[PDB]
Amino acid sequence: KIPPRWLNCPRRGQPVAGRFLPLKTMLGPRYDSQVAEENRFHPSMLSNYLKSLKVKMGLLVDLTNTSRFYDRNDIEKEGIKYIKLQCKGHGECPTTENTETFIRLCERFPELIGVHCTHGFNRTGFLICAFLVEKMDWSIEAAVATFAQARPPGIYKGDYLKELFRRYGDIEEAPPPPLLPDWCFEDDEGAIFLEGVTVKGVTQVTTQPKLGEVQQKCHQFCGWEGSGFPGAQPVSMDKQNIKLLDLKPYKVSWKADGTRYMMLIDGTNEVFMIDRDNSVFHVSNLEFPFRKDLRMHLSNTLLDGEMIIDRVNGQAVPRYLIYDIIKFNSQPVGDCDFNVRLQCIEREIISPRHEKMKTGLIDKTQEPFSVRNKPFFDICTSRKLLEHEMDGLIFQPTGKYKPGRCDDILKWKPPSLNSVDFRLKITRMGGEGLLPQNVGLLYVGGYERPFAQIKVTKELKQYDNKIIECKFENNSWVFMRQRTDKSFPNAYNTAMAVCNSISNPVTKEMLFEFIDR
Numbered sequence: 001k002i003p004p005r006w007l008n009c010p011r012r013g014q015p016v017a018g019r020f021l022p023l024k025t026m027l028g029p030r031y032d033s034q035v036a037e038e039n040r041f042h043p044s045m046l047s048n049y050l051k052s053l054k055v056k057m058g059l060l061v062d063l064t065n066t067s068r069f070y071d072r073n074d075i076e077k078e079g080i081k082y083i084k085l086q087c088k089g090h091g092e093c094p095t096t097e098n099t100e101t102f103i104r105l106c107e108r109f110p111e112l113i114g115v116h117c118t119h120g121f122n123r124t125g126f127l128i129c130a131f132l133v134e135k136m137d138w139s140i141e142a143a144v145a146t147f148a149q150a151r152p153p154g155i156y157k158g159d160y161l162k163e164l165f166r167r168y169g170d171i172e173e174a175p176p177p178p179l180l181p182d183w184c185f186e187d188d189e190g191a192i193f194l195e196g197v198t199v200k201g202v203t204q205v206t207t208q209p210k211l212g213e214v215q216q217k218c219h220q221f222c223g224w225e226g227s228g229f230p231g232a233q234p235v236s237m238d239k240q241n242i243k244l245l246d247l248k249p250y251k252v253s254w255k256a257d258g259t260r261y262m263m264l265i266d267g268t269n270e271v272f273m274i275d276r277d278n279s280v281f282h283v284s285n286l287e288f289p290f291r292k293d294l295r296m297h298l299s300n301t302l303l304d305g306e307m308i309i310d311r312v313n314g315q316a317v318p319r320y321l322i323y324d325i326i327k328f329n330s331q332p333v334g335d336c337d338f339n340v341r342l343q344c345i346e347r348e349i350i351s352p353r354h355e356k357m358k359t360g361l362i363d364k365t366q367e368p369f370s371v372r373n374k375p376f377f378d379i380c381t382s383r384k385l386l387e388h389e390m391d392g393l394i395f396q397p398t399g400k401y402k403p404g405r406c407d408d409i410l411k412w413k414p415p416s417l418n419s420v421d422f423r424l425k426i427t428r429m430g431g432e433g434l435l436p437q438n439v440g441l442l443y444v445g446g447y448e449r450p451f452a453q454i455k456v457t458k459e460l461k462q463y464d465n466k467i468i469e470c471k472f473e474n475n476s477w478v479f480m481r482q483r484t485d486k487s488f489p490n491a492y493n494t495a496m497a498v499c500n501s502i503s504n505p506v507t508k509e510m511l512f513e514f515i516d517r
């Protein structure tokens, strides 16, 4: 497999001290099936560039401790000396012995000296700076700064910088590691608030100070240990799920197809929406008055629900259904009974707003969207629900609120409407071999390899590296609609849950006859 974070890494930086050309590792043609043409870095590319500039490379120093990336003969056949310099492993910075070896080698060799590790930043910069200080009489400050400016923030491991300053300067003056650019983490695993409608007063929060704060407060309100969206995740009903409806009290509601959003009400104009991607949106003119003091405003409140699109003919009106509440005025309402929290919603959220809605002090035609609560019923009447618009049903246990995956919150969906959000990675291939049968692939969060594949189409290349919602039918994933509001695909566990559902489904009649008797 190609190394991580390599596709987005620049191939080369600017020459350092007029002598050293820092590089990421080349990848030979053996990796062409994993690397698109625009991202390829064969050794021939480096030699051809140098030839185009009438520049010779005297020596190439390989710091990767491996021969699996490319063929050294591709370098040596061009008259470039190749040396594989083994460096200390276990993540430690190069030893004094490694630096002496590097200096002894390089002082033998106007022509450039190429230096590369897997990515071309930490080992490469460490050795280059060591040479600059020991042999060219640079200050370590100047060496580190110059390498940072040549290959962007050249050394980003803090212990590397600390050791460089310990060897060549004052360790107490070692700089902290630089903040990393966004491209570093694009391969580790949405700007549109609501898809299809444009919504006033709602503007995404990218301000670095307040973004982390809103996310942090939501984490702490939910008791969420990991990173990411803290809200409860329902799982698709299968023939082994439905038996849970007999084992404890449950409430049902129709599921409109909508966009999950927690709403944090932290102050006066502090109203924020959070989607599954952890993206934050600031809402301006939504007012949440305190029940007891109608002049005062709510703080430390956390909600949960969907944003749905209602159609009042000729125009589509946004609506935000509140279908749970996590915290209220710092009171852990989420630990109370689901009926207690439904009443908390109704009596402490909808009612104080609806008092000032008949006083003229609150104008609903000023507000960004309509705020309602989702009705819940007993399963008994769910049967009648099977006898605004809903694409399925949701079954809520009456227990306390739980973040993360909830095996006991059941989404039932008619089997033909099951869908999964994939990250589309299109990889044009030869396939048959005479006719180039190109085939795109699909990805899920938390799984490194592809979850499955898809057939490449001309209409499909349109959304590439994007997110696509796919229905399953005819033993193939089928594109149905692009998803503009997700920067992230479904989790591997969510995708496997959907597959478990489709291969062991619950038909409408079966759910009907389970509920009835």
Ligand SMILES: *O[C@H]1[C@@H](O)[C@H](n2cnc3c(=O)[nH]c(N)nc32)O[C@@H]1COP(=O)(O)OP(=O)(O)OP(=O)(O)O
Pocket: 065, 089, 090, 091
């Ligand atoms: O053949 C591999 C592999 O068998 C062996 N290896 C790596 N990790 C372990 C381990 O935790 N336990 C055992 N028993 N064996 C292990 O190492 C061989 C390859 O060595 P590498 O050079 O690839 O080690 P690497 O440089 O990748 O480590 P690092 O520099 O990324 O930290």
